[PDB]
Design a binder for this molecule. Structure first.
Ligand SMILES: [Mg+2]
Ligand SMILES: [Mg+2]
Lengths: 188, 188
């Protein structure tokens, strides 16, 4: 969405308030004061506060995915396409994608069933990009195992990096992504 | 420890009470009634209730590790030794190792710093078995990447299986372990 539209100002500013204070502690008053409007005008753009949270999360995933596809477009070989997705995912895991991603992770349980189903639809599209690229890898002979299960293991291996990557000290994210590629591909 | 010794009866029975009710809700009275003793006699064997929790967790790890080493002893090839550790870890992740493992995972924050350092010492030994076996694999030419980082990714990939393995329906744990082996080894 458009950052200068009042919708965009509201979404982008809500992302910070939610990240800083929590969704539950962020009042409708808080958001209106931050955007320089009155409480009651918030609800000209979203049907509910729950819907603002849904849109913050949708925006983050739309952005991560757009970034992924753009990186893929610049990659012409199997090894570079797999590496592009690994790097994008790691960058998202390590606080790239910013406040609105941190909101997705910690405020997940604040979102309505209906909001959640919308955000999960976007996650489905994100996963299909992974499955396309890993399916290409499998077809070219770079992946030994089942494509869907390979993605499930890689999901866990990359996510877990939050528990240890900072403790390492001298390993960069690019080196981490390269090591992930060495694990998942038979050759690169 | 010895299951028929009063120490063993206490530890093995505490493992259930802690798993069923939580450590915090398990009173000294509860444990004494379950073992058929008086509250005050519990503390002839352990210095504290915190120490009973430490010993439940230590026993589980000692047992998992003993099982690991035994499986390794029956494996004569690199592929079977790596698979043995993957299978043992998965079996532990999926509710093998039983009540005392579930206690380790959920009651971790109830354990004292001193108890924790003891349990972490056992985890160190467990990890060194993984590093030995993966180091053998690397030496024989089966692993492309860094041994320590390969173990960190595999830790995350196996742990994450709790979030999805039941939803699959028809995949067995042995098949899951085989798929993990296909990912981590260049050949098997
Ligand atoms: Mg901003
Ligand atoms: Mg028992």
């Amino acid at each position: 969405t458009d950052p200068e539209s009042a919708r965009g100002k509201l979404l982008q500013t809500a992302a910070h308030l939610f990240r800083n204070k929590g969704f539950e502690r962020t009042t409708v008053r808080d958001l209106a004061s931050a955007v320089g409007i009155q409480s009651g005008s918030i609800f000209h753009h979203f049907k509910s506060k729950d819907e603002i949270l849904r849109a913050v999360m949708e925006e983050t995933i739309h952005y991560n995915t757009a970034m992924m596809r753009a990186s893929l477009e610049e990659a012409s070989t199997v090894r570079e396409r797999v590496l592009a997705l690994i790097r994008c995912e790691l960058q998202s895991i390590m606080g790239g994608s910013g406040e609105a991603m941190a909101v997705l992770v910690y405020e997940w349980r604040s979102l309505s069933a209906e909001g959640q189903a919308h955000v999960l639809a976007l996650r489905d599209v994100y996963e299909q990009i992974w499955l396309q690229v890993l399916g290409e890898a499998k077809a070219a002979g770079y992946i030994r195992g089942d494509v869907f299960i390979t993605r499930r293991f890689l999901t866990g291996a990359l996510s877990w990096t939050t528990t240890w990557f900072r403790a390492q000290g001298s390993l960069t994210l690019e080196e981490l992504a390269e090591e992930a590629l060495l694990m998942v591909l038979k050759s690169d």
